[PDB]
């Protein structure tokens, strides 16, 4: 049995929830989302509807992508799946999705954008980001986009990864249009994060992707001959072996009085050899979290399935894959 819908407009949009969730409010804008509260849980959440979902094989894509990670996303430091409905009582008529997740009090960007942190608060932060990161990649998912922004904490200090400039917070790999990256772009980019949270400064503000990498390549210095002897495309390599050869800085003198062991970790993170990156599951042992860090409550993801990545499909077909996993949504354990 369906629930009861009812049908309300909110700013731009029509809106049509179930009457389960009340008080809608939007909270800003892929989709837009509202504030809301769930009668059914007693909670603060927030509801996004996708805006044209399924209106190109991009879209549909997307759509089916967003909703496939969600609903795998099973853990404390991982923004989570509540809840996900549509108004359609059939596939045919199946136009709309609207997704449910906690209500998260603010992001990174605004606790930096108005305060320095204690380096007891980076260290939890820091950890917290690690943990899911660790979790995430476990399933071999990169996240790709990992800015302040993207990351939400509440008034408890507890923090989730999410998905919702750029450029700021990108690996140099990726910025030199490499296609075979790896995960530990990820920790180049929580790189970036500890380091803003410590001195209340964006680290690389670069204008430009060339910019970019010249504020890049003046912190940790031009690539010796060990890295660029891994660089396959001859132009990349040859403006990298154009610039003026820059000396690697002393992390010390850059991040001065800094916690040394948060500028030893910031060290091992801000590699630009992908290779040598530490790893999300090395992070967490690293000293800096020695009063967080515990190996048994850092859980690794179930299997995820990305097979679909590498298919193409027609805008139906991913409609229907997409309403299938709407269909077998199975609601999170209250307790
Ligand atoms: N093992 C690795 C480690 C780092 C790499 C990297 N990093 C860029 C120097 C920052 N870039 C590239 C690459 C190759 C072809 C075209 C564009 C980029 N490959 C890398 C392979
Ligand atoms: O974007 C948010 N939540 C969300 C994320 C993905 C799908 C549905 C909802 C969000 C916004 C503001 C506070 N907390 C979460």
């Known amino acids: 049995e369906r629930p009861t819908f009812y049908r309300q407009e909110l700013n731009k949009t029509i809106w049509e929830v179930p009457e389960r969730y009340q008080n809608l409010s939007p909270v800003g804008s892929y989709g837009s989302v509202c504030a809301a509260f769930d009668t059914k849980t007693?909670?603060?959440?927030?509801?996004?509807?996708?805006?044209?979902?399924?209106?190109?094989?991009?879209?549909?894509?997307?759509?089916?992508?967003?909703?496939?990670?969600?609903?795998?996303?099973?853990?404390?430091?991982?923004?989570?799946?509540?809840?996900?409905?549509?108004?359609?009582?059939?596939?045919?008529?199946?136009?709309?999705?609207?997704?449910?997740?906690?209500?998260?009090?603010?992001?990174?960007?605004?606790?930096?954008?108005?305060?320095?942190?204690?380096?007891?608060?980076?260290?939890?932060?820091?950890?917290?980001?690690?943990?899911?990161?660790?979790?995430?990649?476990?399933?071999?998912?990169?996240?790709?986009?990992?800015?302040?922004?993207?990351?939400?904490?509440?008034?408890?200090?507890?923090?989730?990864?999410?998905?919702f400039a750029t450029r700021w917070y990108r690996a140099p790999e990726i910025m030199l249009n490499w296609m075979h990256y790896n995960q530990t772009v990820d920790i180049w980019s929580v790189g970036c994060i500890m380091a803003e949270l410590l001195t209340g400064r964006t680290l690389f503000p670069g204008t430009d992707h060339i910019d970019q990498l010249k504020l890049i390549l003046r912190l940790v210095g031009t690539p010796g001959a060990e890295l660029l002897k891994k660089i396959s495309s001859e132009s990349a390599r040859n403006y990298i072996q154009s610039l003026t050869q820059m000396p690697k800085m002393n992390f010390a003198n850059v991040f001065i009085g800094a916690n040394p062991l948060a500028v030893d970790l910031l060290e091992k993170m801000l590699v630009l050899d992908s290779?040598?990156?530490?790893?999300?599951?090395?992070?967490?042992?690293?000293?800096?979290?020695?009063?967080?860090?515990?190996?048994?409550?850092?859980?690794?993801?179930?299997p995820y399935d990305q097979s679909f990545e590498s298919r193409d499909l027609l805008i139906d077909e991913w409609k229907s894959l997409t309403y299938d996993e709407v269909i077998s949504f199975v609601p999170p354990p209250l307790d």
């Open 42 to 163: 007693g909670l603060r959440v927030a509801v996004k509807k996708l805006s044209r979902p399924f209106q190109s094989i991009i879209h549909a894509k997307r759509t089916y992508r967003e909703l496939r990670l969600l609903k795998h996303m099973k853990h404390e430091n991982v923004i989570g799946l509540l809840d996900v409905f549509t108004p359609a009582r059939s596939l045919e008529e199946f136009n709309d999705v609207y997704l449910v997740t906690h209500l998260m009090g603010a992001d990174l960007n605004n606790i930096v954008k108005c305060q320095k942190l204690t380096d007891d608060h980076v260290q939890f932060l820091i950890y917290q980001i690690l943990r899911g990161l660790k979790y995430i990649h476990s399933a071999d998912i990169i996240h790709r986009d990992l800015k302040p922004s993207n990351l939400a904490v509440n008034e408890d200090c507890e923090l989730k990864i999410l998905d």
């Open 275 to 302: 290779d040598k990156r530490i790893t999300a599951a090395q992070a967490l042992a690293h000293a800096y979290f020695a009063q967080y860090h515990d190996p048994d409550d850092e859980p690794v993801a179930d």
